[PDB]
Amino acid sequence: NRPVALITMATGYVGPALARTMADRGFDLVLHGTAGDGTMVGVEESFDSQIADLAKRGADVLTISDVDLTTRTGNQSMIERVLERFGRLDSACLVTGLIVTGKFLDMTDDQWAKVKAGNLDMVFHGLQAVLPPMVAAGAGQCVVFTSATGGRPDPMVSIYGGTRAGANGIVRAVGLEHARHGVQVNAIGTNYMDFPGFLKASRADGDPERRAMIEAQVPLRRLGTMDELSSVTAGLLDGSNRFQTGQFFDFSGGWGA
Amino acid sequence: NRPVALITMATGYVGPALARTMADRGFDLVLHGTAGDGTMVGVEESFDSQIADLAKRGADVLTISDVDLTTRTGNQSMIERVLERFGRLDSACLVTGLIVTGKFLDMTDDQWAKVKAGNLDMVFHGLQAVLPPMVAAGAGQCVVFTSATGGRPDPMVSIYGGTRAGANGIVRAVGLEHARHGVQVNAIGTNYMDFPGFLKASRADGDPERRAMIEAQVPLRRLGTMDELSSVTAGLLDGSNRFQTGQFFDFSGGWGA
Amino acid sequence: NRPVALITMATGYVGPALARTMADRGFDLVLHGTAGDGTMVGVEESFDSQIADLAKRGADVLTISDVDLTTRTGNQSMIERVLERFGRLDSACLVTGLIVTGKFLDMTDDQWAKVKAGNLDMVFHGLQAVLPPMVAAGAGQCVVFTSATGGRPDPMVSIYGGTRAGANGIVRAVGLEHARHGVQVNAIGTNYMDFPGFLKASRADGDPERRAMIEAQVPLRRLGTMDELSSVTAGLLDGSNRFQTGQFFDFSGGWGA
Amino acid sequence: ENRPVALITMATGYVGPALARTMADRGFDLVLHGTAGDGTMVGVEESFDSQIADLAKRGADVLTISDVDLTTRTGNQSMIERVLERFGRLDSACLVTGLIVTGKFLDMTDDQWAKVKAGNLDMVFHGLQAVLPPMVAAGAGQCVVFTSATGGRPDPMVSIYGGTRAGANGIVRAVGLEHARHGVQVNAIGTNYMDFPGFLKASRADGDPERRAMIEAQVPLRRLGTMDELSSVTAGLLDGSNRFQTGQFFDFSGGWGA
């Protein structure tokens, strides 16, 4: 019997690559994201284009694209649909967050209201939904993607970086509370990754002059690739490492060290 | 003229002792308080008994008891009133939070909203109100009280400790973002303190067998007094130390070491 | 043109397991350790027996067991022999440390001198030996095994825990000082692992119920295996992840969260 | 009548002078250890001849100790033996430790490595071993070990120095927790960008405003810390007013180590 791996926001960021890598390791996948083709605001790899590659790797694919992951209902709905299809949930990769930057005294009630939703509510409702089935099974592995800024909340990223630290804080407590059930909850915070999502936050967009200045701010003088991030993320979701929980791993080329 | 120091939730916890020593250090006082049934500090010393003593120490007191610090309007209104009374704001001690404990999967949507309001809203709107008058003056010292759990979000205090950890991160960024203006924003996190609030929550206010057990959980084998906590807090708000900002300080007899 | 992977104290702990998986990933190997067989003073797997298996996995092997890794000579010499055999060093796993425990005030000038040599001198000399060949090549992946006590130096393990924390600090700085040359240097710190060393130093066999008392102390209620550890270790040395450096990874089932 | 005793090492510079004045104001008798001599000497920012005079006007007696090697058991053990014979008690101790060593990690020699270990680690291990017995017997005591803000963020060009300082904090943490049940506190203060010679020389900005202008700009609060500020914070951990912190590390670098 093939285990199941849930990957939220799987139309972009690490989802696609992680989906291919998790399939190779013998997992069935339940991708969540934005339904659509390459010409979409939040889609860089479509479901159908993915389902054909994951099927050649021997994986069945449930897809979910009609849930507000910032609410209890949307998260519980996703999990209820995952369990009726496959009847199990062994791994969950909850990608969370809304990026908002600027001066702390220019932040508005709306910005403050919506950064808590992306960075904290997605984590709280996401974990309340994925854990119950893992607790009953006696084994599970979760990876909550927060942000490297949570490890070092810096100026001009105050509310965004602070709430991410709160997310990592929740992850630690939750990772240790359910460790005695064989369920692992860990956090992975990235920064300076090579994907269009981060290219929108920083006005580099492949610009050689602006790209070089961004690559200069990281100790390893390069941006991270989704092939690298998927490898380490799968290491915490493929049952090959069951001795880490409640921890936060900075993945930013030495930036968050 | 005398420097002005604001103290929130000043009827309990560190408020009383802090105002006593700050007056001894030459500060005028703005004491904020609340008797709302849903508040964590409580009423340990009434403003009626405090203004009497603090006036014997040479301080003029402004009292505020009709503002909700979980909202922008309440905080902004509170700062309108201090600047009309004294025309300046130098030090600010923002006590925040709303205690909620339990197993992560037993948390309700309102317990999750009550902790976001106490632990994060009071800080976002509190800091957005005290900083402008300090930045204009080019000087200022702020201390926001979070909790020792922010440095170690443990099981059974997942969303409390977690949101405290998010507030400590906000403090880090804000304390650095406004360091250029000579503004200090630090955060103190306490635990195992000797005051009616904690004594009653742990059911050790009239129990010797309980206190002995409770105190054995602190490396220093005792509960911290408010004179100790005010002495440490006053050193970050009396002008004697202008070289620490954006930092978190554990105050728990080593529990958070 | 297979890349080379150096592993030290490869007769026990992670050495044996790591070698196999590194061989599985296409690495020629250089193994340091002691001579003997059958846990004969730290020999969990004799070199004679390892090369046999590592050869079936298509990996050449060089053995070194006559150097003192607490000195500049032994380390600089060990690398002289690695490069004359293969002419390259792409990965290095430096295992370091001599265990000492007891009351801090009962420690002697001898115990203090010993733990410094195992926990600090080995790291300092080791890194000065493996880095040069990687800096020249422009690529390299190093891992220094310290101890989970380095993330939380506790009583009864003061000098041992502190010196480990010193090792981590070095690894942090060194990992950042050479990230611009494309060289990674990270640290792993374990505790409660299922291997003769910890088992003997914790009364594993003899009071076998004591093992249950020890497992109760780990959040995940188990001892880690060298397969899990080698999988994580290999992931920082197999070239799949080149976006982390100067970081410390606790590996103690959450005990260091 | 009966005054508490406070031991301060390396008292001729850094924080010792400003710390000795505020401790005496708080009613403490003092034990000053330093590399004694006149102001014209290296590391001597304020001679004991002048310090002792100032502290007596503040109502504090003073004992001087200037012939011990604080990197060895014999030195610290002797220092404390002479402290007890004079005052019969030891209540507070501020152990200043370390020896600055910077540069690229590869360029580090066995002698540099051996020396940063003796300054950042040997002084801590032996110092705490000598200070704690009388404090434990007295059921109460407070120690502050001065490491370095680098211990909180070991950066490039300061590897072995910051690394060993990190270990120093780790020892302070373990030792601070192990003896908390005896009423004894041990904490660590790590500073940087302080306005005093030792740092001004290391940073290569002693007589240069242009370079110091750059140095201060590296600090969030855009200035260098003063010994009055540091002595104030330090005295709070040694004057009996705060007995609820131990095994902790306090960064004091204007936000640089936040």
Residue numbers in the entry:
A (entry chain G), B (entry chain E), C (entry chain A): 6 to 262
D (entry chain D): 5 to 262
Quote the original article.
Halohydrin dehalogenases (HHDHs; also, haloalcohol dehalogenases or epoxidases, halohydrin hydrogen-halide-lyases) are biotechnologically relevant enzymes for the production of chiral epoxides and β-substituted alcohols. In their natural function, they catalyze the reversible dehalogenation of vicinal haloalcohols with formation of the corresponding epoxides. HHDHs possess a catalytic triad composed of serine, tyrosine and arginine. Protein engineering of halohydrin dehalogenase HheG for thermostabilization revealed several residues with positive impact on the apparent melting temperature.
After solving and inspecting all of these crystal forms, two (T123G_1 and T123G_2) were chosen for final refinement and analysis, since they encompassed all structural changes with respect to the structure of the wild-type protein. More significantly, the flexible loop connecting strand β2 and helix α2 (residues 39 to 47) adopts a different conformation in three out of eight chains in the asymmetric unit of crystal form T123G_2. As a consequence, the loop moves towards residue 123 and leads to a partial covering of the active site cleft, resulting in significantly restricted access to the active site. It must be noted that this different loop conformation is enforced by altered contacts in this crystal form as the position of the loop in its open conformation is occupied by crystallographic neighbors. However, to form a crystal in which the closed loop conformation is observable, this conformation has to be present during crystallization. Therefore, the T123G mutant favors the closed state more than the wild-type enzyme. In variant T123G, on the other hand, the additional space generated by the missing side chain is partially occupied by L103, resulting in a slight displacement of a loop connecting strand β4 and helix α4 (residues 101 to 107) that covers the catalytic triad. The most obvious change in loop position can be seen in variant T123G, where the loop is moved significantly toward residue 123, partially closing the active site cleft. Therefore, even though HheG wild-type and variant T123G display similar RMSF values, the average loop positions are very distinct. This partially closed conformation for T123G is in line with the observed loop conformation of some chains of the asymmetric unit of the T123G_2 crystal form described in the previous section. Variant T123G was the most active one with a 5-fold higher initial reaction velocity in the azidolysis of cyclohexene oxide compared to wild-type HheG.
